[PDB]
């Protein structure tokens, strides 16, 4: 049929005009096919005969189907799809299984010939014109236009789902106890009714759809849960991901490593503990897609744990709106975090993993914080509410960090759960200078055109070391000069720098970095028992700073 529904008015982009593309000469077999086809459509209302008063033409093709059984009418709309107005988006997100309520009965009805059962805006049809050529372009040809939604046109998906909504609106209202999800051609209808009261409700809907031009299955409902959807396998009872299977090869190509990494990431939504750091590390650095990459011990072991995890099937449960939401976060490897969300002790709703870095220099208290912000957002989308957290951090460690950090930080309802490792700040920075502790006035310089710098230091106890550096930035000579003051120095030490830059990085208590140096400085800091950092205006000539500054810039500066 062709739905009696009103039509969605559409227009071309403002200054632009319809398409006027030249029809390339097609062969007889192809020319014949298109006629046998179009005549069929026309006979149903899908297309109509027009004349050469329409300045708009769109190229038509035809290719053979499976093993060359029947032909197909391809309509290259590119030019029109480029002059057509923009629409809203059909889907802005994709339901996550974990967000589905547990349902007793679910059947999947799929609409047949969707785009063809919906009327096009009358004032727009004139643009959907195309022509069937005459053998070796002699006769003018048959000109046609559309009365329904063209297959490859830009506005078909929008106008269709849009239309399908209005059609459903009544039925939904009369059946408030029935959920209907529309995903393209298919329609998902679930309820708590019995296969009897359910399949009865189904028909009622099929009928409702028919009263609108929508032909739907009868016994080929496909309902039969299981359900393979968007990469998931749904059961009325639970859900899980399409079966994963790991290659088991003797050699791995960049291509193989990628498919694998993709399967695992996809598997991590419900399989806790999935890890791909070592494997992803292998894809670093421009590499062919056919190049063989040797697996390193670490990756070799990682691929192992994953295999182990994937062997016994794991399933996820559905959402119970009444019960609360609980999320726990464990610290797997370094920089890696896994989490599980459940409502009943260990019957996971969904699983996940955070491993983002977020700039160079950062600590576990900060990473843990970000992971919560993610899980929070994620939780909102799927379930409309934020869960209570269970974090492997002391109410103290946290409370002490947040209050002494420049950035503003918040964190939903949580509880400490002792699930090792535990998050901790690996060192503090005394707020008061250390009395009777050697004071180191560090500094550095670097010839910009040469790159030759001398990172040194001078203390109040006479000592004064000065080392030369090659190929370094004015910053390194300042970060190096601090590394020095930390090496040949006792457990307690006051360090005076003129490097806001260094001051900045260190005052933030990073416990891991991307600077080879910064990590070293970190090692030291964890060893000392009392460190005090302070700043003073660089090269302004101040007590002490000047003194060092001198022998630091003395030549080679």
Compute CA distances 366 → 372, 385, 397, 399, 428, whole Å.
Answer: 10, 23, 12, 13, 15
Alpha helix locations (H) across 251-363?
254-267, 277-282, 297-311
Q: Of 100, 317, 445, 548, which one interacts with ligand MSD (CB under 6 A)? A: 100
Joined together, the tokens standing for residue 431 give: 């707020």
Residue 86 interacts with another protein (CB under 8 A): yes or no: yes
- Total binding residues toward another protein, as defined by CB under 8 A: 75
* Residues shown for the chain: 557
Minimum distance of another protein from residue 493's CB (angstroms): 11
Q: Which of residues 173-202 bind another protein (CB under 8 A)?
A: 179, 181-182
User: Binding marks (x or -) toward ligand MSD, 313..332, rule CB under 6 A?
Assistant: -----x--------------
Q: Is 467 in the site for another protein (CB under 8 A)?
A: no
- Cα–Cα distance measured from residue 484 to residue 332, given in angstroms and rounded to the nearest whole number: 34
Our finding on whether 94 is near another protein (CB under 8 A) is yes
Of 308 and 344, the one with the shorter C-beta distance to ligand MSD is 344
- Decide which of another protein, ligand MSD, none touches 110; Cβ closer than 5 to 8 Å per partner kind: none
Task: Report the nearest approach of another protein to the CB of residue 503 (Å).
Answer: 6
Identify which of residues 68 and 403 has a Cβ nearer to another protein in the complex: 403
Q: Is 544 left (phi over 0), alpha (psi -120 to 50) or beta?
A: left
71 binds ligand MSD (CB under 6 A): no
Binding mask 104-123 for ligand MSD (x = CB under 6 A): --x-----------------
Report which DSSP code applies to 345: T
* 95 is an interface residue for ligand MSD by CB under 6 A: yes
Q: How many CB atoms lie within 10 A of CB 142?
A: 18
Distances from the Cα of 5 to the Cα of 21, 116, 204, 212, angstroms: 32, 13, 19, 7
Q: Are 70 and 138 in contact (CB under 8 A)?
A: no
Decide: is 433 part of the binding site for another protein (CB under 8 A).
Answer: yes
Residue (7 or 447) nearer to another protein, CB: 7
Residue that has been written with the tokens 């035809």 in this structure? 62
Least distance to ligand MSD from the beta carbon of 239, Å? 7
Q: Say if residues 464 and 443 touch (Cβ distance below 8 Å).
A: no
Count CB neighbours of 143 within 10 A. 18
Segment 508 to 547, residues that bind another protein, using CB under 8 A:
532, 534-537, 540-544, 546-547
**Is the CB of residue 127 less than 8 Å from the CB of residue 213?**
no
Among 383, 398, 401, 483, binds another protein (CB under 8 A): 383
CA 403, CA 428: separation in Å to the nearest integer?
13
Nearer to another protein, 32 or 126 (CB): 126
CB 481 within 8 A of CB 551: no
The partner in contact with residue 86, picked from ligand MSD, another protein, none with C-beta cut-offs of 5 to 8 angstroms by kind, is: another protein
Region from 95-103, 331-339, 438-446, 488-496 binding ligand MSD, contact rule CB under 6 A: 95-103
């Amino acid at each position: 049929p062709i739905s009696p529904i009103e039509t969605v008015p559409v227009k071309l982009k403002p200054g632009m005009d319809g398409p006027k593309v030249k029809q390339w000469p097609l062969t007889e077999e192809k020319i014949k096919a298109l006629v046998e086809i179009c005549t069929e459509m026309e006979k149903e209302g899908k297309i109509s005969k027009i004349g050469p008063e329409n300045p708009y033409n769109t190229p038509v093709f035809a290719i053979k189907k499976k093993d060359s059984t029947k032909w197909r009418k391809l309509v290259d709309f590119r030019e029109l799809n480029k002059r057509t107005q923009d629409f809203w988006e059909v889907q802005l997100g994709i339901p996550h299984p974990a967000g589905l309520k547990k349902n007793k009965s679910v059947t999947v009805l799929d609409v047949g010939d969707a785009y063809f059962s919906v009327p096009l805006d009358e004032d727009f049809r004139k643009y959907t014109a195309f022509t069937i050529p005459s053998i070796n372009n002699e006769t003018p040809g048959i000109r046609y236009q559309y009365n329904v939604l063209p297959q490859g046109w830009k506005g078909s998906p929008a106008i269709f789902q849009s239309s399908m909504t209005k059609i459903l609106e009544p039925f939904k209202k009369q059946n408030p106890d029935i959920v209907i999800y529309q995903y393209m051609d298919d329609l998902y209808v679930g309820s708590d009714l019995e296969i009897g009261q359910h399949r009865t409700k189904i028909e009622e809907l099929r009928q409702h759809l028919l009263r609108w031009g929508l032909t739907t299955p009868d016994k080929k409902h496909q309902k039969e849960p299981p359900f393979l959807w968007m990469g998931y396998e749904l059961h009325p009872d639970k859900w899980t991901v399409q079966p994963i299977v790991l290659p088991e090869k003797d050699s791995w190509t960049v291509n193989d490593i990628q498919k694998l990494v993709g399967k695992l990431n996809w598997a991590s939504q419900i399989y806790p503990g999935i890890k791909v750091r070592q494997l992803c590390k292998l894809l670093r650095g421009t590499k062919a897609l056919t190049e063989v990459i040797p697996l390193t011990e670490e990756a070799e072991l990682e691929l192992a744990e994953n295999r182990e995890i994937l062997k016994e099937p794991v399933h996820g449960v559905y959402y119970d709106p009444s019960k609360d939401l609980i999320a726990e976060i464990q610290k797997q490897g370094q920089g890696q975090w896994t989490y599980q969300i459940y409502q009943e002790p260990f019957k996971n709703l969904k699983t996940g993993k955070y491993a983002r870095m977020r700039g160079a220099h950062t600590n576990d208290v900060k990473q843990l914080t970000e992971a919560v912000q993610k899980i929070t957002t994620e939780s909102i989308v799927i379930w409309g509410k934020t869960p209570k957290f269970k974090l492997p951090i002391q109410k103290e460690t946290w409370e002490t960090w947040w209050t002494e950090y420049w950035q503003a930080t918040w964190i939903p309802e949580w509880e400490f759960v002792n699930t090792p490792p535990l998050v901790k700040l690996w060192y503090q920075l005394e707020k008061e200078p250390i009395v009777g502790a050697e004071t180191f006035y560090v500094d550095g310089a670097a010839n910009r055109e040469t790159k030759l710098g001398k990172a040194g230091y001078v203390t109040n106890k006479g000592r004064q070391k000065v080392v030369p550096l090659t190929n370094t930035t004015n910053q390194k000579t300042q970060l190096q000069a601090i590394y020095l003051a930390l090496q040949d120095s006792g457990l307690e030490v006051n360090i005076v720098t003129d490097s806001q830059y260094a001051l900045g990085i260190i005052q933030a208590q990073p416990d891991k970095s991307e600077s080879e140096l910064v990590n070293q400085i970190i090692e030291q800091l964890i060893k000392k028992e009392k460190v005090y950092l302070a700043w003073v205006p660089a090269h302004k000539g101040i007590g002490g700073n000047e003194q060092v500054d001198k022998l630091v810039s003395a030549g080679i500066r």
